Point group: D3
């Protein structure tokens, strides 16, 4: 079974401030999302994330991650993640899931 | 059946101006492509797009999309998509296709 | 069989200078990596690369590739690839592999 | 996609006399059936036949075939086949179908 | 996931008498077995039964079934089934299971 | 990958006498065959045997096996197997093979 989707994170004004887990990064923000598979798997599927949209301010550095936290049989937690003085106007992450 | 490929869009001087479908975007351009599968599927495969190359002018904002329009059993329409005063010297999109 | 992973290339000070294979590019650098599949395939799997992290200096152009050189049944060679006066502080490439 | 089923041919009084295609066999009879897959394939599936029931007269020889004539993407023609003075009171053929 | 196996029912002296569920059959006996998959499925697999061994008394009729009662994700109930004055010295049933 | 086939053993006059491996059986004969897959597997496929043809003398007992000896990635050894005073005029074994 193979399922796909898209996560439009949008502007980072709507993102939440989260506490840094990398000592070299501060002001870490993130639009986290809990995606739920249409047809649940039984064993957690292999998931790939892909950044398919980007709108980032040119005066400051491009700092972006498409972070994949975890994958259960039922869904997964992933996020658009930026930090420092980066400004993200728009970030979308397409994803895919395959059983095994 | 799993098939893969790469779409080298190149410079955006060669891209076509297309009419905006987002009210907040103007001067929308796009290198659209109609990809045809080597071995045709019968049911449309799940397709994932991935931006694997980028060459973008630093003086203006990074505005890029890897837009996936549609997927038939026989192929798919996707594009490199930029807008406003963004300059893209180079954009390649790797893709993958899986039956179900 | 489906396998996944992540290649953290990091800062490009640690990358090697490699000779250009594109006449229009100079000062080409690259963090090449030889990934080996946990469970070896017998026929080379289809592999997709995806840039899931980016930290790039804003004063100079964003020049990055997620280059996929080759794929054997046993593994694959891929790299984070930049050139000219681009500065990459961070680049991670998530990948996926599927038999056929 | 994998589909299964069962073909209860029953008594051979209800079977049709068909013309022999083997010179050494006469009085060839056969309960032919045209099975149609619930979910049609696109490429013809590999089909296996299996005799899972038998009720045959002991005074004469056991002559039975589970003959698989053809396989389209949409279904298949198979039959319970006996000949000479064999008497079949009952013959069921379970089958399986797999894409490829 | 595909799993296989074999059910040696042996002599029908060791089989249990079970009550007939077909009005035209009496003295119905059966060696029922509850098979459990090594690697459990999550959705019940499609199962095919196949009689791969037979030792039957020639003075009386060949009456045998390879009956497939049910299939759960975890296993299945099947049996060697005979009736009337048939004598089975030996009956083995090979089986196969496939997810979907 | 799924492959199928048929093994027509024919008359048991052409079968070889082989030494018994069951103490209760004598005069054991067998038409052994070494089948080779058209498209070789890499891991040995799961193989199911099925008797789809039978022509057996009624005056003596039906003693038949569809014996599956071994399965390599490249093929398999199986046989039509009878013993004692059983006479087999005809025995065909259909088979199927699936990767995993
Ligand atoms: C989904 O995400 C939210 C937000 O972080 C979290 O609180 C919740 O526990 C997640 N769901 C699961 C399955 O844990
Ligand atoms: C492929 O793309 C072109 C350009 O947009 C379009 O005109 C054509 O209709 C497309 N093909 C299909 C299958 O519609
Ligand atoms: C893996 O990468 C290294 C570095 O480029 C290379 O020398 C080596 O030959 C590669 N391994 C294989 C399988 O060729
Ligand atoms: C199905 O079987 C019948 C009976 O032999 C035959 O006439 C018919 O043509 C078959 N259908 C197809 C698909 O040809
Ligand atoms: C397995 O078979 C036995 C014997 O008929 C039966 O009692 C038991 O309930 C079966 N197990 C399941 C899963 O029901
Ligand atoms: C195939 O069968 C023959 C006859 O028994 C045997 O001699 C031969 O060794 C077999 N081939 C393999 C792969 O061992």
């Amino acid at each position: 079974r193979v399922q796909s989707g898209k996560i439009n994170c949008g502007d980072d004004a709507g993102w939440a401030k989260v506490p840094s887990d990398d000592p070299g990064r501060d002001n870490t923000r993130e639009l986290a999302k809990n995606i739920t598979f249409a047809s649940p798997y039984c064993r957690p599927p292999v998931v790939l994330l892909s950044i398919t949209q980007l709108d980032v301010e040119q005066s400051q550095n491009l700092r972006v991650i498409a972070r994949l936290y975890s994958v259960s049989p039922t869904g997964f937690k992933a996020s658009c993640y930026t930090w420092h003085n980066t400004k993200v106007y728009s970030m979308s992450i397409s994803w895919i899931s395959i059983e095994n």
